From Swiss-Prot, chain A:
Catalytic reactions on record: TSAVLQ-|-SGFRK-NH2 and SGVTFQ-|-GKFKK the two peptides corresponding to the two self-cleavage sites of the SARS 3C-like proteinase are the two most reactive peptide substrates. The enzyme exhibits a strong preference for substrates containing Gln at P1 position and Leu at P2 position
UniProt subunit comment: 3CL-PRO exists as monomer and homodimer. Only the homodimer shows catalytic activity. Interacts with host FBXO22; this interaction promotes the proteasomal degradation of nsp5.
Domain Peptidase C30: 1-305
Subcellular location: Host cytoplasm; Host Golgi apparatus; Host nucleus
Name used for this protein in its record: 3C-like proteinase nsp5
Organism expressing this protein natively: Severe acute respiratory syndrome coronavirus 2 (2019-nCoV)
Positions of crosslink type Glycyl lysine isopeptide (Lys-Gly) (interchain with G-Cter in ubiquitin): 5, 90
Regulation: Inhibited by pyridone-containing alpha-ketoamides compounds 13a and 13b. In turn, alpha-ketoamide 13b (tert-butyl (1-((S)-1-(((S)-4-(benzylamino)-3,4-dioxo-1-((S)-2-oxopyrrolidin-3-yl)butan-2-yl)amino)-3-cyclopropyl-1-oxopropan-2-yl)-2-oxo-1,2-dihydropyridin-3-yl)carbamate) inhibits SARS-CoV-2 replication in human lung cells. Inhibited ex vivo by michael acceptor inhibitor N3. Inhibited ex vivo by compound 11a and 11b.
Function: Cleaves the C-terminus of replicase polyprotein at 11 sites. Recognizes substrates containing the core sequence [ILMVF]-Q-|-[SGACN]. Cleaves and inactivates human TRMT1, preventing tRNA guanine(26)-dimethylation of tRNAs. May cleave human NLRP1 in lung epithelial cells, thereby activating the NLRP1 inflammasome pathway. May cleave human GSDMD, triggering alternative GSDME-mediated epithelial cell death upon activation of the NLRP1 inflammasome, which may enhance the release interleukins 1B, 6, 16 and 18. Also able to bind an ADP-ribose-1''-phosphate (ADRP).
Active site annotation, chain numbering: 41 (for 3cl-pro activity), 145 (for 3cl-pro activity)
Cytoplasmic side of membrane: 1-305
Length: 305, 303
C-alpha cells in the first residue's frame, strides 16, 4: 500500500537524449531514428530572442553549424528542417536505442513524465499534468529546453511534450513533438501570461478513490448528488466540470470500492463547501489533482513495463 | 524556476532488475556482475512467513530451485549464500549492463530514488526519505520485494535500499544491500512497531531556502534565535534537533540567499508556533521535509 507521485522509468528516453550546439547556444535534443528534434530557438542569440525571425535566422544556417553530440559520439548533420517551433536535423546515424514510439498531443488534465536534461545529460525525472490553462508546473533552469515529457505503454514511448520557456509565476510552456504550442504561447521573450488555471476535477475524484483504497475514508459522507448539481458547485470553486465521459473513466475505481461516482462527488462537494479543517487525505492538506484515473489504477494494481 | 519532488534517472538500475522465482514465490532481484541479490523470504511458503527459521528453510533449497529470468532469458544459478536478510545467487553470466556501483548504508534524513518493480519489470520511479524511525513512506504492493532504492553520483549508482515488507501503518521497511535492516524490524509476519516518527528539521530548512529562491518569501522575518532556543521550540513539535553540523550543511544555501541559517530557523519557529494562517509555501499547505540540502542545491543549480 501507500500512494506516491510516480514517474515512468526513464531508461528508454535517456537513450534518446543528445546535446545540440548551434553557435554559443547549447540545449537538448531528442534522437529518434536518424532525426534529432530540438527547440528551434537554439539558433538564436540572446538578442534574437526578444523578437526573432526564425525563417531568416535558419536559412542563413548550414548543416555544419549544428553540433549534435550523443555522449562520446558525434553525429554528423546532413539536413536541417523547421516544423512549427521545432528544428528537425537529419543525421547520418540512426539511433540504435530508438524505442517503439508515437508522437501524441495530450489534452489538459492528462499527466506525463518529464526527463529534465542539461547539455544532453538527463538530470532527473518527475511527474506533471497538462494544466487546463495549457501550462505545466515544472522544474526547469536555463538550458533545460529540449527536455521531453512522455508516457509509456508497455514498451511504446508516447512523446507528448518538449520544453521551451518559462512564463510569469514560474510555470512552463512547450510544444508537442510537431512543434505546436500547448496554449496561446509563442517562443519569443515578450509579455505573455498563462490565464486563470482550474482544478482538474476528474483527477481529484481519482485521488479520492486512491485514498479510500488505502484506508483514508473520513471524508465519505451519507449524501449524494446529481452530476449537474455537483458541477454547479464545482464551477463556483474553479473546478473543471465533470462530464459523463469522466464518469465512465472512473468506472474501474468505482467498481473496486463499491462507491458510486456520484456518491463520491457528494463527498467532494462538501469538501469544497466546508473546507478540510486542517485534516489530511493521504498525507496532503490540499486536494491533489495531478493523478489521472489511469495513474491511480496503475499504481494500485501494479502495472509494469 | 519551479521546485518538484525529483528522482534520479532510473535507466542504469532498470538494466539490473531480474525476476527471481523459487517454487511458487516470485519477487525482484538486482543483477550486478555475476550475482543476483534478493530478499531472503523468497524461500518462504505462505505459512513459513509467520515464523521462519531461514537457515533450516534454505538448507532444503538447491541451486536448481531458483529460477532467475532476465527479460526473457533464464539465467543459470550456480551457487547461493545468505548474507543477513538477503540471498546472494551466483549466476553463470555477469550482467553486461552492470553500472559503476557501490553499496552504502544511509543515515536517517537522507533521500533516495526507488524503482518499484513487479516480476522483475520496472513499474515506476519515485523519491523518498529514510525517516528518523528507519521506515520509508512508499508505494509498494505484493511482489514489490527486491525493489531497490539508489542514488546516482555522476555515473556511479550507490544502492542503499532493498524493499522487504510493509508495516501496520502503511509505511515500509527494508535493508541495505548487505541485508542488514534499517531500524529494529525483522523479516517475519508478526506485529511490529516503527515507533514515533519525527520531522527532518534540516530538510525543512532546505525546503524553505528552495522557497525563497523561487520567490515565495512571505514567511521570512528579521527575527533571530539561538540553536538552543530553536531546538527547545522544535522538540515541542516533534522536530529533530538542529545541530551545528546541520548548520554547516545548510551553508551554501544560506550564502546563496543572504539569509543566515539562524534567521531562517527563527522563521521556522514562527511557523510552528503560529501555523501557516492558511498560507502555502511552494504550493504546499504543510512543511515538506524530504528534500535534503544537497537535493535543493542540485535542483536549483542543475547538477
Ligand atoms: C532554455 N534554454 C530556457 C529554459 C527556461 C529559462 C529559465 N527556465 C526555463 O525553463 N528557455 C529560455 O530561456 C526561453 C528562450 C528565450 C526566453 N526564454 C524564456 O523562458 C523566457 N520566458 C519568456 O520570455 C516568457 F515569459 F514569455 F515565457 C525567460 C524570461 C528567460 C524565462 C525563448 C526563445 C522563449
Ligand atoms: C513482498 N513482495 C511483500 C511486499 C509487501 C506486501 C504489501 N506491500 C509490501 O510492501 N512483503 C511481504 O509480504 C512481507 C514478507 C512476509 C510478510 N510481509 C509483510 O510485508 C507483512 N508485514 C508484516 O508482517 C509487518 F507487519 F511486520 F510489517 C504484510 C502484513 C504481508 C504486509 C515477510 C517475510 C516479512
Amino acid at each position: 500500500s501507500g500512494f506516491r507521485k510516480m514517474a515512468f522509468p526513464s531508461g528508454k528516453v535517456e537513450g534518446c537524449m543528445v546535446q545540440v550546439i548551434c553557435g554559443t547556444t547549447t540545449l537538448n535534443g531528442l534522437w529518434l531514428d536518424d532525426v534529432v528534434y530540438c527547440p528551434r530557438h537554439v539558433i538564436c542569440t540572446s538578442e534574437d530572442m526578444l523578437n526573432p525571425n526564425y525563417e531568416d535566422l535558419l536559412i542563413r544556417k548550414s548543416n555544419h553549424n549544428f553540433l549534435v553530440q550523443a555522449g562520446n559520439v558525434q553525429l554528423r548533420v546532413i539536413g536541417h528542417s523547421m516544423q512549427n517551433c521545432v528544428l528537425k536535423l537529419k543525421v547520418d546515424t540512426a539511433n540504435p536505442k530508438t524505442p517503439k514510439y508515437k508522437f501524441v498531443r495530450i489534452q489538459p488534465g492528462q499527466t506525463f513524465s518529464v526527463l529534465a536534461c542539461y547539455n544532453g545529460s538527463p538530470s532527473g525525472v518527475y511527474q506533471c499534468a497538462m494544466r487546463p490553462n495549457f501550462t505545466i508546473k515544472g522544474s526547469f533552469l536555463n538550458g533545460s529546453c529540449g527536455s521531453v515529457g512522455f508516457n509509456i505503454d508497455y514498451d511504446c514511448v508516447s512523446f507528448c511534450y518538449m520544453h521551451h520557456m518559462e512564463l510569469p509565476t514560474g510555470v512552463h510552456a512547450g510544444t508537442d513533438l510537431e512543434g505546436n504550442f500547448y496554449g496561446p504561447f509563442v517562443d519569443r521573450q515578450t509579455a505573455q501570461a498563462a490565464g486563470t488555471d482550474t482544478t482538474i476535477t476528474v483527477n481529484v475524484l481519482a485521488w479520492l478513490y486512491a485514498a479510500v483504497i488505502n484506508g483514508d475514508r473520513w471524508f465519505l459522507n451519507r449524501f449524494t448528488t446529481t452530476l449537474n448539481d455537483f458541477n454547479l458547485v464545482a464551477m463556483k470553486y474553479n473546478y473543471e466540470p465533470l462530464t459523463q465521459d469522466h464518469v465512465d473513466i472512473l468506472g474501474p475505481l468505482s467498481a473496486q470500492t463499491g462507491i458510486a461516482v456520484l456518491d463520491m462527488c457528494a463527498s467532494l462537494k462538501e469538501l469544497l463547501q466546508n473546507g478540510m479543517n486542517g485534516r489530511t487525505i493521504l498525507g496532503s492538506a490540499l486536494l491533489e489533482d495531478e493523478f489521472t484515473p489511469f495513474d491511480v489504477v496503475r499504481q494500485c494494481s501494479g502495472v509494469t513495463f
